[PDB]
Design an enzyme around this catalytic site. Structure first.
Site, short mmCIF file in Angstrom:
data_model
loop_
_atom_site.label_atom_id
_atom_site.label_comp_id
_atom_site.label_asym_id
_atom_site.label_seq_id
_atom_site.Cartn_x
_atom_site.Cartn_y
_atom_site.Cartn_z
N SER A 7 0.85 -1.22 0.05
CA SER A 7 0.12 -0.13 -0.09
C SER A 7 0.81 1.26 -0.04
O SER A 7 1.84 1.44 -0.90
CB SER A 7 -1.09 -0.12 1.11
OG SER A 7 -1.88 0.89 1.15
N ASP A 11 -9.26 -6.32 -6.35
CA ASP A 11 -9.06 -5.31 -5.15
C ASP A 11 -10.07 -4.17 -5.26
O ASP A 11 -10.33 -3.60 -6.03
CB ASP A 11 -7.57 -4.66 -5.70
CG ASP A 11 -6.98 -4.13 -4.27
OD1 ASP A 11 -7.60 -3.68 -3.34
OD2 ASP A 11 -5.64 -4.17 -4.29
N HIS A 64 -6.77 -7.20 -0.79
CA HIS A 64 -5.73 -6.14 -0.79
C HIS A 64 -4.30 -6.44 0.14
O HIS A 64 -3.39 -5.93 -0.02
CB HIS A 64 -6.04 -4.83 -0.14
CG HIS A 64 -5.27 -3.79 -0.04
ND1 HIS A 64 -4.41 -3.05 -1.14
CD2 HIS A 64 -4.73 -2.85 0.89
CE1 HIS A 64 -3.74 -2.24 -1.09
NE2 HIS A 64 -3.65 -1.83 0.19
#
Lengths: 684, 267, 175
Positions: free
Chosen positions: B96, B217, B246
């Site tokens: 991320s 996602d 994710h």
């Protein structure tokens, strides 16, 4: 003039209790058990302070002994008469104490690339042994007369450090370890220091000390000098074992001719050749003819669906074992396999052991039938005062009447897995044993629902003192008397079950009810989500005036601790559901809580809703949590005016390892928060 | 300083191997999110794990709001840690926002980041002209409002959306880590991340790049992986996992461990 | 033949001030110090009690006679057999009666209760001693050292720096 002869009343009357000879005060305060009142009086005056210091026999040190504050205590912190010393709760919880093994700080498997100059902690064994000796010397100085000692042992180096100071007097030892046994230890090495140093040992305890049976066999059978003198033994091993095998138990029995009390889970599964058969039973009986207390169990797992198979123990073997041990008075034999037709065994027990008083049997079928003109099986053992049963699938009301007529001295009664028992037989037994029956236990009896059982116990309701029940709610107003002697209650609840119907079932007025434990069992994930306003019903118990101690065990309540799939309920909301209304307990003085466990997390972590629920119980003096939590939840409880005794006891095998990797509670945070708590000015 | 930051950011040295790999976790998580996959590389690589300053594991008192309003200070913390570990060269695997952090670091210190492995990477989240970041400004502001009005309710509604696949254990772990976050800090850093746009600097990333993209996602459209492979300056490859979500380090450790050990063989 | 009335042997008691009390030897039997002198056969002329006054002696006599009466009225077990359910109920009542007798028996002023404590020790009457000894323990129960000080009219002897230090050292007392 003068006119002054009328002032002669000013003599300060002395407290004649102080005018008493000092041994009299020592005698008086020898009767005082509650440490709170003990030390309150000790704070009243210095002479009383000395008296209370000299009258103490047992003690559990709270806080860090390694802390210099405990280390630099004055000579006043002196306990010559202290016998029982408990060091298993010292801060931090679950840590090796006086351990000579160096900390595993950054020791990943790999050659250290020797190009790095920054902050390497060079280990100093000399200093480590130095503080270990100094702390041991200080403990001996404060507590010179320790003979029964309880200590948390991660590693036997703790024992090697502690033994020399009390080896001459130490006669009973309790070892504690919920953490994993150190794999690098030699077999039996955990017990070797005691078998080598403490010649005075007479009782040994390892019920909750996790270790392997082979360690026990090695240490014991290779120390016959010490094993010939032991008198009491426990082998529960945190119940994390599948059970001792016959080949393990044998040489143990050989090295110990002098045992009197034994508790040990054992491999009773007949599918193992090394299971405990009648041969091992009689070998033990011959090896220890002087035995008095025996508590033997078969470890089992919940996946064992209705163990209909037989055990490796015959009635003839039972009879012979009873004959070989005339000195028995306490007996516990709990099995998952069934022993059929053990009534003649019970007759041989009564005949050969007239001193039999305590009996506990599991899955034994046909113990009492009342099938003849004479009392049969246990119905003849009239000298029995204690009786608990597990999985007696064929026990009847006539059997109950026969037992009551025979065991007229029965004071505590218990049945588990007895599906054929009705409220009629229960009421008959209560009436028959009414002068003597004071305790009754009913668990998972199919016909015996809560209301019927409570109704059937009316004859002894005025005399009953403690009660245990699993709650099963079904889908004139005669005056049912208050539970005038009922001081303790044990509750078993299925997951999602409501506590509110208990008050209606017959348990409304318990004026002397002082302590209660509630156990909640079941998989909450499979249980449907209750309505958002549904509560367990803790507030419904406020009708009990002297209700002070609580034991809410939800560790067995397993759910998605933090997020359930759509339609299900998380353990955060579950904690809110179960703990709601706890603040209604005005006299709530002690609480023992088990955080629910998630299978995916090794930890029973406490959620914030539970934090808020508990924080509002101002009357709570003592709080024991059997898990872990966030550091940010900790400061809330300082708002509770009165709590001191707070310790996260991860006392469930395996105790999770706490090494700088978890967001949950840390040791340094624990010590500084103990400083915070003991920093608050407290009531007197 | 780096040395105290090691303690502050829980910097720990494990594993063995000449190959140094840097793991940085994602939003609402910590370095233990790599535990399910940590052993797979400990044999072949000397593994470095650290906690971001926003993790509830670090003292929330240490969160400097004003310096940590940009990914620059987080890159700074990572670089100070690595310099404290005298690492002259290493590969980086980011999750991320950690991917953006590694992008900025390899731009700043190409000499240290030999190779980059990206799990759920996004240089920008807001949809633009000819750019589908998968989110609009209204959705982001609604997320802000849901979290500020009720962080508990928002996190409960968000964690299964983030994890995606029906794996209650991974969802529970992410819920734990997300709930350990502090609400004011969380709003601050989420504002920091959603606003970050590294689309203009991907080409400066010299290091070979490994993009891990899942089947579905909630926040990363597959077009984002295409944009990343297109714009990143280093030789960029995208690995697609046959799972949705994710945080594959919690949901499908096997597949992601396969991909990583394939990538970390040589760099 | 006239029925010979069982004559309860009388032991003569001479208190501290010179007052005399006539009691059965079975009453005098309880007090171990009195008990011992009985077999010493020095009780023919009466025993001196220079440390016991008439009032405390009378109340001690009351207590001892009451407890001897309770012992006699308790249904004795029939040679090794457990008492019948009726017999258990009879003995349970006598204990409850005797315990109730005990509670108001120590419901006296501190000095008399303090005096009750001394005499049972000098007389080696453990039952009376323990009843009075625990009586003080209950009336100390539930109190802070301060109102304890007033309750016994004790002046607080701790300097503020001492009393502060000792209070925190003993913080595990109240909690």
């Amino acid at each position: 003039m003068a006119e002054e002869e009328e002032v002669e009343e000013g003599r300060s009357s002395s407290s004649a209790i102080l005018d008493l000879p000092e041994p009299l005060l020592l005698h008086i305060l020898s009767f005082l058990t509650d440490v709170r009142s003990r030390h309150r009086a000790a704070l009243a005056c210095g002479r009383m302070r000395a008296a209370e210091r000299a009258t103490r026999s047992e003690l559990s040190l709270r806080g860090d002994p390694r802390s210099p504050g405990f280390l630099f205590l004055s000579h006043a912190f002196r306990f010559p008469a202290l016998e029982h010393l408990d060091l298993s709760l010292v801060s931090p919880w679950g840590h090796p104490l006086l351990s000579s093994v160096p900390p595993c700080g950054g020791g990943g498997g790999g050659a250290p690339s020797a190009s790095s100059s920054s902050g390497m902690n060079v280990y100093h064994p000399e200093a480590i042994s130095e503080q270990n000796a100094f702390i041991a010397a200080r403990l001996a100085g404060c507590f010179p007369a320790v003979t029964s000692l309880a200590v948390y042992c991660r590693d036997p180096t703790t024992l090697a450090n502690l033994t020399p100071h009390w080896q001459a007097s130490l006669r009973r030892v309790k070892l504690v370890r919920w953490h994993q046994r150190p794999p690098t230890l030699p077999d039996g090495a955990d017990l070797e220091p005691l078998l080598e140093t403490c010649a005075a040992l007479r009782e040994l305890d390892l019920s909750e000390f996790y270790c392997w049976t082979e360690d026990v066999v090695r240490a014991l059978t290779t120390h016959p000098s010490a094993t010939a003198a032991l008198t009491h033994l426990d082998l529960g091993l945190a119940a994390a074992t599948d059970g001792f095998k016959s080949s393990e138990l044998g040489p143990i029995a050989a090295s110990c001719p002098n045992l009197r009390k034994l508790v040990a889970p054992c491999l009773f599964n007949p599918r193992f050749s090394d299971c405990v058969g009648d041969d091992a039973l009689l070998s033990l009986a011959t090896s220890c003819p002087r035995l008095t207390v025996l508590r033997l169990s078969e470890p089992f797992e919940a996946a064992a669906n209705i163990q209909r198979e037989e055990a490796a123990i015959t009635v003839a073997g039972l009879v012979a074992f009873f004959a070989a041990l005339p000195a028995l008075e306490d007996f516990t034999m709990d099995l998952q396999h069934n022993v059929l037709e053990a009534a003649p065994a019970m007759e041989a027990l009564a005949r050969r052991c007239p001193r039999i008083k305590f009996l506990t049997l599991g899955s034994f079928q046909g113990l009492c039938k009342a099938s003849w003109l004479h009392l049969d099986g246990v119905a003849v053992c009239g000298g029995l005062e204690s009786l608990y049963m597990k999985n007696c699938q064929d026990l009847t009301d006539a059997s109950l009447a026969a037992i009551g007529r025979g065991c007229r001295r029965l004071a505590k009664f218990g049945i588990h897995g007895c599906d054929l028992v009705t409220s009629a037989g229960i009421r008959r037994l209560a009436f028959t044993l009414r002068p003597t029956l004071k305790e009754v236990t009913v668990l998972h009896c199919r016909l015996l629902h809560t209301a019927e059982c409570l109704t059937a116990l009316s004859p002894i309701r005025d005399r009953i003192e403690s009660l245990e029940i699993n709650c099963v709610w079904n889908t004139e107003f005669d005056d049912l008397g208050s539970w005038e002697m009922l001081r303790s209650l044990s509750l078993w609840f299925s997951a999602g079950q409501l506590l509110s119907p208990l008050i209606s079932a017959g348990l409304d007025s318990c004026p002397v009810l002082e302590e209660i434990s509630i156990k909640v069992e079941g998989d909450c994930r499979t249980c449907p989500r209750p309505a958002p306003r549904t509560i367990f019903g803790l507030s419904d118990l406020a009708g009990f005036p002297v209700l002070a101690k609580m034991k809410l065990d939800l560790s067995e309540a397993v759910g998605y601790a933090l997020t359930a799939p759509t339609g299900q309920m998380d353990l955060s909301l579950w904690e809110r559901f179960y703990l709601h209304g706890i603040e209604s307990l005005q006299t709530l003085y002690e609480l023992d809580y088990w955080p629910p466990q998630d299978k995916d997390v090794h930890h029973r972590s406490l959620t914030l809703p539970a934090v808020g629920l508990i924080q509002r119980c101002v009357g709570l003096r003592k709080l024991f949590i059997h898990g872990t939590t966030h550091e940010h939840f900790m400061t809330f409880f300082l708002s509770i005016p009165n709590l001191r005794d707070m310790q996260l006891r991860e006392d469930y095998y395996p105790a999770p390892e706490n090494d700088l990797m978890f967001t949950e509670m840390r040791a340094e945070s624990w010590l500084r928060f103990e400083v915070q708590l003991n920093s608050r000015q407290i009531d007197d | 300083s780096g040395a105290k930051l090691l303690q502050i950011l829980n910097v720990r040295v494990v594993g063995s191997g000449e190959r140094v790999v840097v793991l940085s976790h994602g939003f609402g998580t910590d370095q233990s999110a790599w535990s399910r996959v940590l052993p797979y590389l400990t044999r072949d690589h000397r593994v470095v794990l650290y906690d971001l300053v926003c993790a509830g594991s670090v003292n929330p008192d240490h969160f400097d709001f004003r310096r940590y309003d940009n990914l620059d200070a987080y890159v700074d913390d990572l670089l100070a840690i690595l310099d404290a570990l005298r690492i002259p060269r290493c590969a980086f695997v980011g999750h991320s926002v950690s991917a953006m952090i590694g992008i900025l670091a390899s731009i700043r210190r190409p000499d240290l980041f030999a190779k980059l492995v990206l799990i759920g990477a996004s240089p920008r989240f807001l949809n633009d002209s000819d750019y589908h970041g998968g989110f609009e400004l209204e959705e982001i502001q609604q997320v802000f409002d849901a979290m500020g009005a009720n962080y508990s309710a928002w996190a409960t509604g968000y964690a299964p959306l983030a994890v995606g696949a029906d794996v209650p254990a991974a969802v529970q772990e992410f819920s734990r880590t997300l709930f350990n976050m502090r609400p004011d800090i969380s709003l601050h850093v989420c504002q920091t991340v959603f606003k970050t746009d590294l689309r203009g600097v991907l080409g400066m990333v010299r290091a070979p790049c490994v993009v891990v993209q899942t089947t579905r996602d909630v926040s990363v459209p597959a077009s984002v992986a295409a944009y990343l492979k297109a714009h990143l300056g280093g030789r960029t490859t995208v690995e697609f996992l046959q799972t949705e979500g994710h945080l594959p380090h919690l949901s499908a450790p096997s597949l992601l461990a396969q991909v990583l050990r394939r990538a970390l063989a040589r760099y | 033949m006239a029925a010979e009335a069982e004559t309860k042997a009388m032991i003569t008691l001479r208190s501290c001030e010179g007052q005399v009390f006539e009691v059965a030897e079975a009453v005098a039997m309880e007090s171990q110090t009195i008990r011992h002198m009985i077999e010493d056969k020095c009780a023919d002329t009466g025993i001196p009690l220079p440390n016991v006054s008439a009032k405390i002696l009378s109340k001690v006599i009351e207590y001892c006679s009451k407890h001897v009466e309770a012992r006699g009225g308790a249904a004795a077990a029939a040679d090794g057999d457990a008492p019948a359910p009726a017999a258990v109920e009879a003995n349970k009542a006598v204990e409850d009666e005797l315990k109730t007798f005990d509670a108001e028996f120590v419901k006296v002023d501190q000095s008399t209760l303090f005096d009750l404590i001394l005499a049972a020790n000098y007389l080696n009457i453990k039952g009376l001693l323990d009843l009075t000894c625990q009586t003080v323990a209950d009336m100390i129960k539930g109190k802070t050292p301060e109102e304890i000080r007033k309750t016994f009219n004790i002046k607080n002897d701790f300097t503020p720096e001492e009393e502060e230090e000792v209070r925190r050292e003993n913080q595990w007392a109240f909690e």
